[PDB]
């Protein structure tokens, strides 16, 4: 997973080998956007909060920054919509979305 | 954690010893066995696992006495109120503080504890693999901004303590007529910025 | 008049010894006094010795700096239990009768245990085990076998409190505290014969002396007042503790003589006991640490010894020793193997003391006239009385006319002086050797190239240290025991360790290569360059087309070998075993065939030397290489060390000359392959990939047999790795086949001078599978290593198999896989150093005391015999041929040839 983020060759020799790394030339490190705006966005997308429902084998769990915030159906449609909004300029480029079918 | 016997435990940083899982959920206001089971999922094997877990709990604690037990672990103060306050303090400020520190946040922390237990159970049954600690999805970089934020937080806390001490001493050694006569100079003459400057510089 | 301590036996001091050994009875708690003078009867008396300047010791009469100090004693009012012996005292009490004091054991048990102790004396652990067993057996007993009196249980309370649990007339158990006087009375009655079983020696450690009656006082030098920056005489913690001890002792004595109640006497007794315990050990268990005047725990006698930087563990250290230098090293083969080049500036500082005699007076006179600036000069001159003077320029003209027998001159380093040479990390014995100085300009430690292997040094910034021994004994030891000549054969495997490395092999092959001839000019020039003493050229072999004479390389090389050497073997270039078989047949048939017949059957893969004439074969690593140096080993073991040194010093220069003036290089075209070989490699790779895909499909469709050692996936991985390794080997074989011997890189690989066949394979044909910890690459995204492959793919290309050689260039994914492999290699190299160092440290600490006695036995430091006739044959591994005690085959052949010739 270091591909494109950490230089695979530049590293000191000796005890520090591997433990000290250098950023690749294409690497970009992100800052933080206000999280409550993002939470309002996902809530507007149609994710019913966890207070009104419970996780089920036929339901998708949505995590924001690592905390569970609600449940949804057809998570693929949700992530497709979020990506389309991201590259339409509606929201910032800081937002990253991934889904696990397993 | 899930022991080799199948009984779940929670390891709070302040509490010297692990606590049984159902006790911790009941301390957070989630007392119903049905609700405790529901908070972690609906897979029947998981339901049976937690049926075994609550049977191990043996309904010793159902609504209360869980906080009292925790107080027994966390340096009991020999008082009902003392043990209660210690238990609620370590519950609010050491059980998932990122979810909040208000007593209302306990019901929210219950769901996070439930999902963590669900993860442990799924790993126990082999339904999911281990988590790779070197995967960069699980790593973050501490940039200069956040490190400066933490250092400034510490230095500002020190400055606030010095402000309080200086204000108290000046009032107790000068009387009321000076403090409230003109509060501007009273506030201004207690700052001592050198504490902050030297702390940040030496760090 | 100067003797050497042969042994140190430890024991327990007796009060009489402490009384007579000491000089002054300290009674008054007196400090340094306001005028800084020793108060009479104080802790720092003048009989204790003086550290303050400007006064004389009372006892020895020595000024500070020359008085070693003297001991004083304190007369205690009441017995005090020593903290260290408390557990021993408690163990003893539980084993002896309260009335008789003898050991509560039967006579037969005493005899059996005495026999066992006599047998297991030396083994400390077994001795302790026997002592513990006897202690348990005696403590379990209740009725004394001699008196029959009851023995009330003794309870030990840390640190120095003993309770006797007695039963009253009502049967209740009450704890009776044993005062130290009671313990002493109990201990005195123990007879001498019972001490060995009890774990004691009745000549150096008696149980009564464990309880202290007289407390010795260390001398002032042992407890010096370091003073302070303000001038305040900062005292020693021992001094303060002694002051408190004296005060409490006087107080207890005066209250005893005043008829005081028992309670206050007990209070002062316990205060004295606590002070004594904290003075002996301020960190004793169950003892509150006494605080300094600043509130910190005082450093006491125990803390003064159990310190890593103290007397123990601290004296052994590595510090900046005198007369040493350190600088980078550069190569030069123009000096002998036992020589080192020293920069002038270093030589003008590391002086060596030389005593002027009758046969070297003029040389030292010239040197001292040169001053400390001209190179052949001196820096210090010592008169026979002992004063040292700097030559400088003011008195440079004198100190030479007044220099005669008995003086000492610290001259600069000159050619011929002996000098040690070190390289860290120092692993084996050969990391330090003695060289001869040769002063040359610039600033580098020049080192001959044949000496690189034992030092394990490369000229890429490595640094070396040299030390100059000063005394004559050290110089003689370095010259005789540590010279480079004596260490040609390695003690590890019994073969050579000093020899040619890179050019000394390739150039030797070029010189002795079949079909190589040299003109007269080259022959004369190379012979003169090598230093070979010659004055007439041998008969020319073969004439040039235009009429010039020519000489084959074999004869030129044979000019170096001794006149009666004879040997034959097979080198690494043997590729047609039939010719070697024919030559061996002829040689074995005759043992001295006519050299004409050998010429027709000559083959460069079979070295054969007859009476110092090279008749067949070519020089390679097996001649005089780092190991398996057949010829060099033969020279060392048959003609002495000096002949071997001369031979090495000549062959090195000869080979260097021939390679320098004959031309040796390598270009990008050295790994250019014909088109057919490239097609063969491509089809091999494609076939291997197809087989791997077939394996993957068979695994996917459930057609797989899991061997018991592995599951399905592990068996699949094993098969894949085997297939890929075999494919890489086949590609390497093809590439090696299509690469000729005339190629310079192939020469370097084949002769063993540098590199392996695998290097050529990787650089030309195929790089091969990349692995981490013996497994295929797997650490990456979920189900795939990189992000450019379909998830859940197990194909060869997608898990670290790279199909491009270095010449063709790697695709980015292959580059990343190669980076993974290289990173793993670097990590392993980093960690193995520490692991090996730890293991070596353990082994050395375990084994550094064994040595060969004068009767051939090897004895442990405690006297146990470890090995009769070291090595079970008595042969030094260095002197062994290659492990065998005597190579009788070579002896037979050599003697037969010498006497039948
Ligand atoms: Mg190096
Ligand atoms: Zn003296
Ligand atoms: Zn007895």
Shape of chain C: extended
Major pleated sheet of chain A: 3 strands, antiparallel
Oligomeric form: part of a larger assembly
- Estimate the helix proportion of chain A, in percent: 10-25%
PDB class: transcription
Keywords: RNA, Polymerase, Elongation, Complex, Pyrococcus furiosus, Archaea, Transcription, DNA
Entry title: Cryo-EM structure of Pyrococcus furiosus apo form RNA polymerase open clamp conformation
Chains A, B: DNA-directed RNA polymerase subunit beta
Q: What does this molecule look like?
A:
Chain A: DNA-dependent RNA polymerase catalyzes the transcription of DNA into RNA using the four ribonucleoside triphosphates as substrates. Chain A: It is found in: Cytoplasm. The structure is cut from a larger assembly and holds two copies of chain A and one copy of chain C (901 residues). With 102 residues, chain A is of the alpha+beta class. Chain A is 23% helix and 13% strand. A three-stranded antiparallel beta sheet of chain A has the order 1-3-2, with no helix packed on it. In chain A, a hairpin with a 2-residue loop joins β2 (60-64) and β3 (67-72). Chain A is elongated, with a radius of gyration of 18 Å. Chain A starts with 34 loop residues before the first helix and ends in a 16-residue tail after the last helix. Chain C has 901 residues and is α+β, with helices and mostly antiparallel strands. Helix content of chain C is 37%, strand content 13%. Chain C contains 27 helices and 26 strands. Chain C has a six-stranded mixed β-barrel. In chain C, β2 (154-157) and β3 (161-167) form a beta hairpin. In chain C, α16 (520-530) packs across α21 and α23 (712-738) packs across α25 (757-764). The radius of gyration of chain C is 41 Å and the shape is extended. The two termini of chain C are 62 Å apart. In chain C, 28% of the residues are buried. The interface between A and B is medium-sized, with 14 and 18 residues. The complex binds magnesium ion (MG) and zinc ion (2 copies). One zinc ion (ZN) binds next to loops of chain C.
């Amino acid at each position: 997973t270091h591909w494109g983020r950490i230089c695979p060759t530049e590293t000191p020799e000796g005890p520090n080998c591997g433990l000290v790394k250098n950023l690749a030339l294409m690497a970009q490190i992100t800052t933080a956007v206000p999280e409550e705006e993002i939470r309002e966005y996902l809530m507007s997308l149609g994710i019913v909060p966890i207070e009104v429902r419970r996780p089920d084998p036929t339901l998708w769990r949505v995590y924001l920054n690592g905390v569970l915030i609600g449940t949804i159906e057809d998570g693929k449609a949700l992530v497709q919509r979020i990506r389309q909004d991201r590259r339409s300029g509606k929201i910032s480029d800081v937002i990253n979305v991934a889904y696990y079918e397993d | 954690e899930r022991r080799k016997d199948g009984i779940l435990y929670v390891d709070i940083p302040n509490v010297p010893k692990p606590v049984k899982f159902v006790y911790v959920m009941r301390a957070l206001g989630l007392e119903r066995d049905k609700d405790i089971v529901e908070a972690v999922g609906n897979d029947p094997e998981v339901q049976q696992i937690m049926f075994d877990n609550l049977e191990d709990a043996s309904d010793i604690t159902t609504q209360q006495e869980a906080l009292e037990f925790i107080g027994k672990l966390v340096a009991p103060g020999q008082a009902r109120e003392y043990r209660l306050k210690r238990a609620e303090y370590v519950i609010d400020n050491n059980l998932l503080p990122h979810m909040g520190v208000s007593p209302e946040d306990r019901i929210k922390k219950a769901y996070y504890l439930g999902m963590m237990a669900l993860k442990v159970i799924e790993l126990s049954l082999g339904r999911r693999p281990e988590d790779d600690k070197d995967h960069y999805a699980n790593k973050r970089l501490r940039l200069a901004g956040d490190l400066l934020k933490d250092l400034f937080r510490v230095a500002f806390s020190q400055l606030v303590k010095d402000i309080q001490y200086q204000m108290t001493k000046t009032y107790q050694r000068k009387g009321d007529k000076y403090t409230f006569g003109n509060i501007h100079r009273f506030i201004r003459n207690s700052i001592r910025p050198d504490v902050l400057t030297e702390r940040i510089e030496h760090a | 008049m100067k003797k050497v301590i042969g042994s140190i036996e430890f024991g327990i001091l007796s009060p009489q010894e402490i009384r007579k050994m000491s000089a002054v009875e300290v009674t008054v708690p007196d400090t340094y006094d306001d005028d800084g003078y020793p108060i009479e009867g104080g802790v720092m008396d003048k009989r204790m010795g003086v550290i303050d300047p400007g006064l004389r010791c009372e006892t020895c009469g020595g000024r500070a700096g020359e008085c070693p100090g003297h001991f004083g004693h304190i007369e205690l009012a009441r017995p005090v239990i020593h903290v260290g012996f408390a557990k021993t005292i408690y163990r003893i009490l539980e084993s002896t009768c309260r009335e008789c004091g003898r050991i509560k054991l039967t006579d037969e048990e005493i005899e059996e245990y005495m026999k066992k102790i006599e047998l297991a004396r030396n083994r400390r652990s077994e001795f302790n085990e026997i002592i513990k067993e006897i202690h348990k057996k005696a403590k379990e007993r209740m009725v004394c076998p001699h008196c029959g009196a009851p023995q009330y249980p003794i309870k030990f309370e840390k640190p120095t409190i003993y309770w006797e649990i007695r039963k009253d007339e009502q049967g209740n158990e009450y704890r009776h505290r044993l005062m130290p006087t009671e313990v002493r009375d109990w201990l005195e009655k123990i007879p001498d014969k019972d001490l060995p079983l009890l774990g004691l020696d009745p000549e150096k450690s008696r149980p009564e002396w464990m309880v202290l009656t007289v407390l010795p006082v260390p001398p002032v030098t042992a407890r010096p007042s370091i003073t302070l920056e303000t001038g305040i005489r900062a005292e020693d913690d021992l001094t303060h503790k002694l002051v408190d001890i004296i005060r409490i002792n006087n107080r207890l004595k005066q209250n005893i003589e005043a008829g005081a109640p028992q309670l206050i006497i007990e209070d002062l007794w316990d205060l004295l006991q606590y002070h004594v315990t904290t003075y002996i050990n301020n960190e004793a268990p169950g003892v509150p640490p006494a605080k300094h005047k600043s509130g910190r725990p005082l450093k006491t006698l125990a803390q003064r010894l159990k310190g890593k930087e103290g007397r123990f563990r601290g004296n052994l250290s590595g510090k900046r020793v005198n007369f040493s230098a350190r600088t980078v090293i550069s190569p030069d083969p123009m000096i002998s193997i036992n020589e080192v080049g020293v920069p002038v500036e270093v030589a003008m500082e590391l002086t060596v003391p030389e005593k002027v005699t009758e046969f070297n007076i003029e040389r030292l006179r010239k040197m001292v006239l040169n001053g400390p600036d001209k190179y052949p000069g001196a820096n210090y001159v010592i008169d026979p009385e002992g004063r040292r003077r700097r030559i400088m320029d003011s008195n440079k003209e004198t100190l030479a006319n007044q220099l005669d027998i008995g003086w000492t001159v610290e001259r600069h380093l000159m050619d011929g002086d002996i000098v040690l040479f070190n390289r860290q990390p120092s692993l084996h014995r050969m990391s330090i050797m003695a060289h001869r100085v040769r002063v040359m300009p610039y600033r580098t430690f020049r080192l001959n190239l044949a000496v690189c292997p034992p030092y394990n040094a490369d000229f890429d910034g490595d640094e070396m240290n040299l030390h100059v021994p000063q005394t004559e004994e050290a110089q003689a030891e370095a010259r005789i025991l540590m010279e480079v000549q004596n260490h040609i054969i390695s003690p590890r495997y019994g073969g050579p360790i000093i020899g040619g490395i890179q050019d000394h092999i390739s150039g030797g092959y070029l010189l002795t290569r079949e079909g190589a001839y040299f003109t007269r000019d080259e022959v004369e020039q190379m012979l003169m360059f090598a230093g070979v003493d010659i004055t007439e050229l041998p008969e020319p072999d073969k004439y040039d087309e235009n009429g010039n004479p020519l000489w084959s390389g074999k004869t030129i090389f044979s000019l170096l070998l001794p006149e009666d050497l004879t040997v034959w073997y097979r080198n690494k270039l043997c590729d047609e075993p039939e010719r070697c078989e024919a030559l061996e047949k002829l040689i074995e048939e005759k043992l001295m065939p006519d050299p004409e017949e050998v010429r027709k059957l000559a083959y460069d893969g079979f070295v054969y030397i007859q009476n110092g004439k090279l008749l067949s074969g070519a020089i390679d690593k097996k001649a005089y290489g780092r190991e398996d140096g057949i010829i060099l080993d033969l020279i060392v073991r048959e003609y002495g060390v000096e002949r071997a040194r001369q031979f090495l010093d000549q062959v090195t220069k000869l080979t260097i000359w021939v390679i320098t003036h004959k031309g040796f290089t390598t270009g990008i075209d050295d790994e250019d392959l014909p088109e057919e070989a490239r097609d063969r490699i491509r089809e091999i790779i494609r076939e291997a990939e197809e087989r791997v895909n077939k394996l993957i499909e068979a695994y996917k469709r459930g057609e797989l047999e899991p061997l018991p050692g592995k599951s399905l996936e592990d068996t699949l991985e094993s098969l894949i790795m085997a297939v890929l390794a075999e494919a890489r080997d086949n590609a390497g074989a093809v590439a090696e086949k299509y690469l000729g011997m005339d190629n310079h890189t192939v020469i370097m690989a084949k002769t063993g001078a540098r590199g392996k066949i695998l290097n050529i394979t990787q650089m030309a044909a195929l790089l091969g599978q990349q692995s981490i910890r013996g497994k295929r690459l797997y650490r990456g995204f979920r189900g795939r290593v990189l992000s450019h492959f379909k998830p859940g793919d197990l194909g060869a290309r997608a898990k670290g198999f790279v199909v491009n050689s270095y010449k063709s260039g790697l695709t980015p994914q292959e580059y990343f896989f190669h980076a993974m492999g290289g990173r793993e290699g670097l990590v392993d190299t980093a960690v193995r150093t520490a692991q090996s160092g730890y293991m070596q440290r353990r082994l050395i600490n375990a084994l550094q005391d064994l040595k060969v006695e004068y009767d051939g036995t090897v004895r442990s430091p405690e006297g146990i015999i470890v090995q009769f006739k070291y090595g079970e044959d008595g042969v030094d591994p260095m002197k062994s041929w290659r492990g065998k005690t005597v190579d009788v085959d070579r002896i037979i052949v050599r003697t037969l040839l010498k006497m039948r010739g």
